[PDB]
Amino acid sequence: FDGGSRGKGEHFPYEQEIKFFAKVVLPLIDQYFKNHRLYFLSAASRPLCSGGHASNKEKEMVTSLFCKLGVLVRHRISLFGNDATSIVNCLHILGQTLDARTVMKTGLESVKSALRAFLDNAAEDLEKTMENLKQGQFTKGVTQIINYTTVALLPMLSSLFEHIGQHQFGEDLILEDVQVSCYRILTSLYALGTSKSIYVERQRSALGECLAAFAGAFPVAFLETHLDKHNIYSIYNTKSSRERAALSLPTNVEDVCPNIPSLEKLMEEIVELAESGIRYTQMPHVMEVILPMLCSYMSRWWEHGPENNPERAEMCCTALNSEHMNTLLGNILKIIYNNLGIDEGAWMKRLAVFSQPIINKVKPQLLKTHFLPLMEKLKKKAATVVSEE
């Protein structure tokens, strides 16, 4: 129908078939997997204590169906009759239904390659969106791919990344060349977030959630590259020098992601922004994307921090300190105090739920003398739309 569509035959000989597909197949794919999402997830790992978990073959063919649905949705949001939302829902729920560990350790190579190519395809699509958005603001194929990205690709990548991160399937799902694709993805999302394009300002937040989920999912300490040598799943350690030079890779852990600053650096910019206390329109980029970015990253690497595992300390991938989390949360709370009087807004409703994990990991003796100030800064406003918790 791609070749039949520009012809007179807009009515297609299998229009009944496509109507049946859109009306029935997609909603049942939603409903069945929503009802039994735990069944496919269960792999004798203790979920589904009743018994009868999904087979490994069933899991792998579910994963293959996910990739095929992504292939279908790729750049066809307009071709689908406003049901692209339904396909987005299908992909989002299937992402939760996926089990990556089982299919990695035991899976069919064709499905493995389909899934790898899906991740790659998302990567070059996002890279193309960057390159066109940067080279030209002028408005069409590029508009179509931009809309495709913003509508489907970013939400589905966000959902998949959040799923993989909260099930901890990254460290075994993403090892070879899929790590490279996701380095491309991280550079892409970060550059898009820090872009000052009025066009990306509209869809800015969705980039925030997507890149935050990616930060939570990515299993290599990308902010701190000084001692990534301790990382055993590191692409540099696993791939080695011969293959690293063979692949189009900068061969330097610092050079693999130039634009993104280090964790320490972003801490000094975060604190100086904190003393600055500027209005939201002055620098929305940092405090709407990078703050969730750092929150997610520290929430992800805290347990890998040496203080979490005192034995085998200083051999850890990256150093996480309670002092650093308290400094960060202090930055949030006090910039929230500065900007709360200034017209408020929904970004702080978002930031509250992004910063929920760190305010959970923080100690309760640290909760006193810290949230009590947050309480009084709540009560300073007679009527407060933005209820910071």
Side-chain angles (χ1 to χ4, degrees):
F1 182 76
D2 286 320
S5 62
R6 275 89 71 189
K8 179 274 294 182
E10 181 66 28
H11 66 83
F12 185 74
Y14 293 98
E15 210 277 321
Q16 187 271 332
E17 280 73 2
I18 192 66
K19 174 63 57 63
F20 170 67
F21 171 72
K23 285 308 159 84
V24 179
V25 175
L26 288 162
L28 62 84
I29 293 169
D30 288 328
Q31 188 62 256
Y32 189 75
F33 286 84
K34 189 173 305 304
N35 296 332
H36 320 100
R37 64 151 308 299
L38 190 151
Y39 162 80
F40 300 112
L41 182 63
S42 54
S45 71
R46 294 285 71 77
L48 196 63
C49 64
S50 66
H53 65 86
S55 85
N56 172 76
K57 160 82 179 75
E58 287 178 349
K59 288 144 149 67
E60 67 87 17
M61 55 177 295
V62 161
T63 60
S64 177
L65 185 145
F66 171 73
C67 306
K68 296 186 289 176
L69 287 181
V71 173
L72 271 294
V73 76
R74 197 188 210 260
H75 321 301
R76 268 75 56 88
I77 75 164
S78 49
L79 282 75
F80 293 164
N82 296 115
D83 54 271
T85 80
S86 48
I87 294 90
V88 172
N89 315 323
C90 296
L91 285 182
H92 155 71
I93 193 64
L94 266 292
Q96 282 90 68
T97 74
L98 311 180
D99 190 287
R101 182 151 306 136
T102 44
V103 70
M104 294 298 102
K105 67 180 183 292
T106 60
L108 187 58
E109 187 64 25
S110 48
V111 179
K112 295 181 184 292
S113 66
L115 123 95
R116 282 187 293 261
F118 159 67
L119 265 188
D120 167 65
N121 277 284
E124 69 274 15
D125 293 335
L126 189 48
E127 289 288 325
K128 288 187 287 185
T129 45
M130 232 166 343
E131 64 90 15
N132 58 58
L133 183 63
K134 268 71 177 175
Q135 63 87 29
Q137 61 274 14
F138 171 68
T139 76
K140 184 64 187 295
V142 299
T143 295
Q144 198 260 358
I145 66 169
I146 283 281
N147 299 329
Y148 163 65
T149 298
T150 65
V151 166
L153 191 62
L154 294 174
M156 65 180 288
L157 294 174
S158 192
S159 63
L160 179 60
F161 285 150
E162 193 272 328
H163 166 71
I164 298 300
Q166 64 88 27
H167 279 130
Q168 285 79 41
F169 281 32
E171 53 280 30
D172 62 357
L173 182 63
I174 187 168
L175 279 330
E176 290 88 6
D177 296 332
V178 291
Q179 291 183 356
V180 177
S181 67
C182 289
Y183 281 77
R184 303 209 283 122
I185 303 178
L186 61 83
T187 59
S188 72
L189 293 181
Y190 182 76
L192 292 174
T194 47
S195 179
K196 279 76 177 175
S197 165
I198 61 171
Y199 293 99
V200 71
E201 296 303 294
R202 298 285 74 78
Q203 298 87 19
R204 172 171 165 73
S205 64
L207 282 71
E209 290 88 6
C210 184
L211 183 62
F214 182 76
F218 195 95
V220 178
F222 63 91
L223 290 175
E224 291 185 354
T225 62
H226 60 87
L227 277 296
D228 285 334
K229 47 178 292 311
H230 281 264
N231 188 216
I232 190 66
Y233 293 116
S234 180
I235 187 66
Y236 278 36
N237 304 356
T238 56
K239 197 57 158 56
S240 69
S241 58
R242 199 16 56 223
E243 292 82 3
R244 190 185 303 119
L247 189 152
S248 66
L249 188 153
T251 77
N252 289 317
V253 55
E254 59 274 59
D255 284 26
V256 71
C257 54
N259 50 306
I260 187 141
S262 85
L263 183 63
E264 288 80 14
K265 283 151 54 196
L266 294 175
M267 283 307 35
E268 40 269 23
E269 292 83 4
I270 287 299
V271 307
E272 62 95 8
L273 210 81
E275 291 94 9
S276 86
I278 44 181
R279 186 267 183 275
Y280 179 101
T281 71
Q282 280 77 337
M283 187 66 204
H285 312 93
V286 191
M287 65 182 179
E288 193 276 331
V289 161
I290 298 168
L291 274 71
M293 269 331 127
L294 294 174
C295 293
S296 42
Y297 182 107
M298 274 203 313
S299 66
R300 191 265 183 278
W301 298 99
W302 182 257
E303 69 274 18
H304 301 151
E307 313 186 347
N308 276 253
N309 50 3
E311 182 295 310
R312 201 256 299 160
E314 173 281 349
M315 283 73 74
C316 306
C317 297
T318 186
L320 277 296
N321 185 7
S322 48
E323 165 61 54
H324 294 88
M325 291 156 324
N326 321 307
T327 315
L328 164 64
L329 61 83
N331 301 128
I332 295 87
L333 58 84
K334 184 261 288 183
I335 67 169
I336 305 299
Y337 308 154
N338 312 134
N339 210 350
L340 61 83
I342 300 169
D343 72 83
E344 289 179 318
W347 71 107
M348 294 182 286
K349 299 289 94 176
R350 312 190 286 250
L351 294 174
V353 300
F354 295 93
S355 63
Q356 183 62 255
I358 178 165
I359 73 167
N360 309 144
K361 270 87 73 176
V362 66
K363 276 85 74 181
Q365 50 273 20
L366 281 71
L367 294 174
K368 286 129 359 235
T369 66
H370 295 88
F371 287 13
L372 295 153
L374 188 153
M375 295 298 102
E376 68 183 0
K377 303 318 312 175
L378 294 174
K379 278 74 96 177
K380 69 183 289 184
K381 195 65 172 90
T384 301
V385 185
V386 182
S387 179
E388 290 90 3
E389 190 277 330

